[PDB]
């Protein structure tokens, strides 16, 4: 009643376009089917809600890197989430499709923004688990990236995970063959898939054998520095992968553009 629903918006995802009638504010309205909810969380109030609402609540401290949850409702058979909607926006998946391999400069800006966003999640005790181009929105005006869809997320823990319902082609080798992984190292792996994707125009692996293989072939001209970082993130042994500090101290990561500069140079 506070919001006017509009058209569907991303396959198998039940997200609509909306406007808050109070301030005429663009929003996104996600519906989650109670009978489909695999991971259930609990609020401070003892209210049983989907993990996603818990994770969104914890990360919504006004750091623009993550899409903030503006509100949620319970319904007989579903939950409804109101999320901020930037305008104009295009998801990074569609963006790469339309533009192909991105110049390193743009890839650098984007990647950095994604890292900052993922670090913030971790600092807030949240693990995304589904980092991919599809799950990143671009504010075309501001040049700001925003991480979305925490439906596969979990509470961050320093111990081993034995569940996963993220994107397989982004999942790490250890998951594929052992059914176990550590959050941060898994994240770094997926960030390596993501970076390949930006600079090559698509993900490196399609099949479990390729994943387990850890053979990274470059289809496009990519600089040594960037290849090094990608190979590093996609190290087969989780322990061999860089930390976020190591990623952000990598030579390839030096001299990032501000989101503003990125907009002017790359999106206008």
């Amino acid at each position: 009643s506070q919001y006017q629903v509009g058209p569907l918006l991303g396959g198998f995802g039940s997200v609509y376009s909306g406007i808050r009638v109070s301030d005429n504010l663009p929003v996104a309205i996600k519906h989650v089917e109670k009978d489909r909810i695999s991971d259930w969380g609990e609020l401070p109030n003892g209210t049983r809600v989907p993990m996603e609402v818990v994770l969104l609540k914890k990360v919504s401290s006004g750091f623009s890197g993550v899409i903030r949850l503006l509100d949620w409702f319970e319904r007989p058979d579903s939950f409804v989430l109101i999320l901020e909607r930037p305008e104009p926006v295009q998801d990074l998946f569609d963006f790469i499709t339309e533009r192909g391999a991105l110049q390193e400069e743009l890839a650098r800006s984007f990647f950095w923004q994604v890292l900052e966003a993922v670090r913030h999640c971790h600092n807030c005790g949240v693990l995304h688990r589904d980092i991919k181009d599809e799950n990143i929105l671009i504010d075309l005006n501001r040049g700001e990236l925003k991480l979305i869809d925490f439906g596969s997320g979990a509470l961050l823990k320093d111990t081993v995970y034995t569940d996963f319902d993220g994107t397989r082609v982004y999942s790490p080798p250890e998951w594929i063959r052992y059914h176990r992984y550590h959050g941060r190292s898994a994240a770094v792996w997926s960030l390596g898939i993501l970076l390949y994707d930006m600079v090559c125009g698509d993900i490196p692996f399609e099949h479990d054998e390729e994943i387990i293989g850890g053979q990274v072939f470059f289809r496009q001209r990519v600089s040594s520095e960037c290849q090094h970082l990608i190979r590093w993130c996609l190290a087969l042994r989780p322990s061999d992968r860089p930390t976020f500090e190591e990623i952000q101290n990598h030579p390839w990561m030096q001299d990032v553009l501000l989101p503003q500069e990125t907009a002017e140079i790359h999106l206008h």
Binding site: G10, G11, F12, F93, I96, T97, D130, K132, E134, G151, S152, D165, G166, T167, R168, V169, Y170, G201, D202
Partner: peptide, 7 residues
Amino acid sequence: KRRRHPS
């Protein structure tokens, strides 16, 4: 061929 993948 480049495509989306499910969760």
